[PDB]
Amino acid sequence: MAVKKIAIFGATGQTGLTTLAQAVQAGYEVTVLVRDSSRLPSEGPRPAHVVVGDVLQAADVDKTVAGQDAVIVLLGTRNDLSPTTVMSEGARNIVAAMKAHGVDKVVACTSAFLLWDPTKVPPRLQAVTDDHIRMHKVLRESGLKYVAVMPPHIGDQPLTGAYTVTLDGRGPSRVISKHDLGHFMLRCLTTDEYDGHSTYPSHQY
Ligand SMILES: NC(=O)c1ccc[n+]([C@@H]2O[C@H](COP(=O)([O-])OP(=O)(O)OC[C@H]3O[C@@H](n4cnc5c(N)ncnc54)[C@H](OP(=O)(O)O)[C@@H]3O)[C@@H](O)[C@H]2O)c1
Ligand SMILES: Cc1cc2nc3[nH]c(=O)[nH]c(=O)c3nc2cc1C
């Protein structure tokens, strides 16, 4: 049976917005959890269901995950680089809600730093990366079908659908367009080939 209903977390972020637009255009019935609905666009494709609330509130997460076939996680801290547990605590709530509701597929974005040499993280990004590592642990220990998406720098290049996906953080480049990253997260909904793996999408634009 194919995935039809999905929840997206972080849909108002850079990658989230284009993942959401692509998912709706592709035919998915999409639910989003957003703190502030004014951050969703009026033009273009629109989510089927909008839950207003916070990924740190279990009940809000629960309402969002109920009834879904799969979950996409594109949480982040925007330009905030201070020490943080928002992503990992959010993922804890998502896992609990998935288990409560029988949902078994999650595709979640962290970063290529979790594949590269772990002493090459730029200092200003260490705190966020530490929480990406906590989030990754939460998801891989959940006992759910988890695709870990670990992108390099996220750019603004056009959608191509022509990027390369490796399993080790080596690839044709150190950039992926936000649109291609979103396309890849949706690709992960229709294959099991990356379940239980870490993936590195990249492309030369
Ligand atoms: N930037 C890069 O080059 C790069 C490269 C590799 C990996 N990454 C990682 O890739 C992931 C996606 O990044 P992005 O740039 O697309 O993200 P982003 O622009 O930071 O968007 C973060 C998203 O998370 C949502 N969010 C944050 N706190 C939340 C909360 N408490 N409750 C509900 N939602 C919350 C934000 O909502 P609001 O709209 O309400 O703020 C927004 O939708 C991030 O984890 C980032 O660290 C980034
Ligand atoms: C190459 C690369 C750049 C990044 N920039 C980033 N920039 C940012 O503001 N937050 C991040 O979490 C972030 N992660 C990155 C991860 C990788 C692998």
Swiss-Prot record:
Protein name per Swiss-Prot or TrEMBL: Flavin reductase (NADPH)
Regulation of its function: Mesobiliverdin acts as a competitive inhibitor for flavin reduction, indicating that flavin and tetrapyrrole substrates compete for the same site. Inhibited by a wide range of xanthene-based drugs, such as phloxine B, erythrosin B, tamibarotene, sulfasalazine, olsalazine, febuxostat, ataluren (PTC124) and deferasirox.
Catalytic residues (positions): 109, 188
PANTHER family registered for this protein in UniProt: FLAVIN REDUCTASE (NADPH)
Catalysed reactions, semicolon-separated: reduced riboflavin + NADP(+) = riboflavin + NADPH + 2 H(+); bilirubin IXbeta + NADP(+) = biliverdin IXbeta + NADPH + H(+); FMNH2 + NAD(+) = FMN + NADH + 2 H(+); FMNH2 + NADP(+) = FMN + NADPH + 2 H(+)
Protein family according to the UniProt entry: Belongs to the BLVRB family.
Modification Phosphoserine, positions: 42, 82
Complex formation: Monomer.
Gene3D superfamilies per record: NAD(P)-binding Rossmann-like Domain
InterPro entries: NAD(P)-bd_dom (IPR016040), NAD(P)-bd_dom_sf (IPR036291), Polyketide_Oxido-like (IPR051606)
Pfam families for this protein: NAD_binding_10 (PF13460)
E.C. designation(s): 1.5.1.30, 1.3.1.-, 2.6.99.-
Tissues expressed in: Predominantly expressed in liver and erythrocytes. At lower levels in heart, lung, adrenal gland and cerebrum. Expressed in adult red blood cells.
Gene Ontology, cellular component aspect: cytoplasm; cytosol; extracellular exosome; intracellular membrane-bounded organelle; nucleoplasm; plasma membrane
GO molecular function, one term: biliverdin reductase [NAD(P)+] activity
GO BP term, pick one: negative regulation of insulin receptor signaling pathway
Coiled-coil stretches: none
Positions contributing to NADP(+) binding: 10, 12-15, 35, 38-39, 54-55, 75-76, 78, 87, 109, 132, 153-154
